[PDB]
Design a protein around this ligand. Structure first.
Ligand code: IND
Ligand code: CL
Ligand code: CL
Length: 162
């Protein structure tokens, strides 16, 4: 298992514009297009990203392309983040995957707000971090996905994904 396969399971794959769990226009593998309530604005954002007049639909190759870009950007953002980087550096490979999954989902900002959990993870207090992580809007809104990621940090294995 790896980050790509992990996120592919968490996000699914859709080739037509759809609304995410928060009601935002998205496409492909979790690629958020816009927070605006406007489908037009979303189709324009789509065309701008793909580089063609898509008409709200993309191919699988174009989806995988957006996905590669988004994964790379997430990692790169973590590495540029002074709050995140040190935590990320302290983790083992499996757990780094869980850290990227959270950023992919909620943004660097969203994550930066889990200050207490990050500090526990950095200290390798796995069980306590898992409990603290669960006390969040994230966990209450997307419980099954949160549980998988939390299990990952708790155990350092891919068990939740097998
Ligand atoms: C960097 C980015 C996201 C993260 N989530 C938990 C730890 C961590 C570190
Ligand atoms: Cl883009
Ligand atoms: Cl869920």
């Amino acid at each position: 298992m790896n980050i790509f396969e992990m996120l592919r399971i968490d996000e699914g794959l859709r080739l037509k514009i759809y609304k995410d769990t928060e009601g935002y226009y998205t496409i492909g593998i979790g690629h958020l297009l816009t927070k605006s309530p406007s489908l037009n604005a979303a189709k324009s954002e789509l065309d701008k990203a793909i580089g063609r007049n898509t008409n709200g639909v993309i191919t699988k190759d174009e989806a995988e392309k957006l996905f590669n870009q988004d994964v790379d950007a997430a990692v790169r953002g973590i590495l540029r983040n002074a709050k995140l980087k040190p935590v990320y550096d302290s983790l083992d490979a499996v757990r780094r995957a869980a850290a990227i999954n959270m950023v992919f989902q909620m943004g660097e900002t969203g994550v930066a707000g889990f200050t207490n959990s990050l500090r526990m993870l950095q200290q390798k207090r796995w069980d306590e971090a898992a409990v603290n992580l669960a006390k969040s809007r994230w966990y209450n809104q997307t419980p099954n996905r949160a549980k998988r990621v939390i299990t990952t940090f708790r155990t350092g294995t891919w068990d939740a994904y097998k």
